[PDB]
Amino acid sequence: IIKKELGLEKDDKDAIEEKFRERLKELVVPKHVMDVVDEELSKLGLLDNHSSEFNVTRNYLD
Amino acid sequence: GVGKTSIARSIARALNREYFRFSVGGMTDVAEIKGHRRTYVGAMPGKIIQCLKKTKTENPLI
Numbered sequence: 001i002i003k004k005e006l007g008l009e010k011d012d013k014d015a016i017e018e019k020f021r022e023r024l025k026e027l028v029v030p031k032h033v034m035d036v037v038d039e040e041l042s043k044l045g046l047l048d049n050h051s052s053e054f055n056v057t058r059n060y061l062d
Numbered sequence: 063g064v065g066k067t068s069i070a071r072s073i074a075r076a077l078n079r080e081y082f083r084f085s086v087g088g089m090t091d092v093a094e095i096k097g098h099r100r101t102y103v104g105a106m107p108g109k110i111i112q113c114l115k116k117t118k119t120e121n122p123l124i
């Protein structure tokens with residue numbers, strides 16, 4: 001309850017979402033790769049963190 | 063590029079039933095039409111269910 005109520009909620013999956021977004025931030029992202037990355041991030045978020053398809057999505061994102 | 067998408071849209075408009083396009087070429091994941099049993103975390107239904115939901119009608123022009 002301390003972890004969630006404090007305001008850190010939704011911080012889950014940030015290591016695979018926020019860190020990569022920052023990694024792309026310094027890069028001048030073209031539109032094509034930008035939209036591809038957005039789609040891949042959405043697929044990663046939808047998929048469970050502990051499945052093989054999620055691992056493949058994470059590998060492609062990296 | 064013979065306006066197949068555009069002509070399909072025009073016939074959908076003329077026939078008065080709601081329009082919706084669907085790309086299947088190159089697809090391999092049959093789950094995109096079947097989704098998953100919903101036991102998986104974040105599982106989503108087949109794309110046809112989404113099409114019906116978005117179209118809001120039971121007789122669209124797929």
Ligand SMILES: Nc1ncnc2c1ncn2[C@@H]1O[C@H](COP(=O)(O)OP(=O)(O)O)[C@@H](O)[C@H]1O
Nearest residue numbers: 063064065066067068069070071072083084085
């Ligand atoms: N007579 C026409 N009137 C309006 N649009 C047309 C016409 N002929 C071709 N087009 C355009 O050509 C595009 C082609 O899509 P389509 O022929 O379905 O497949 P492709 O992806 O091979 O082009 C459409 O966006 C459409 O607007």
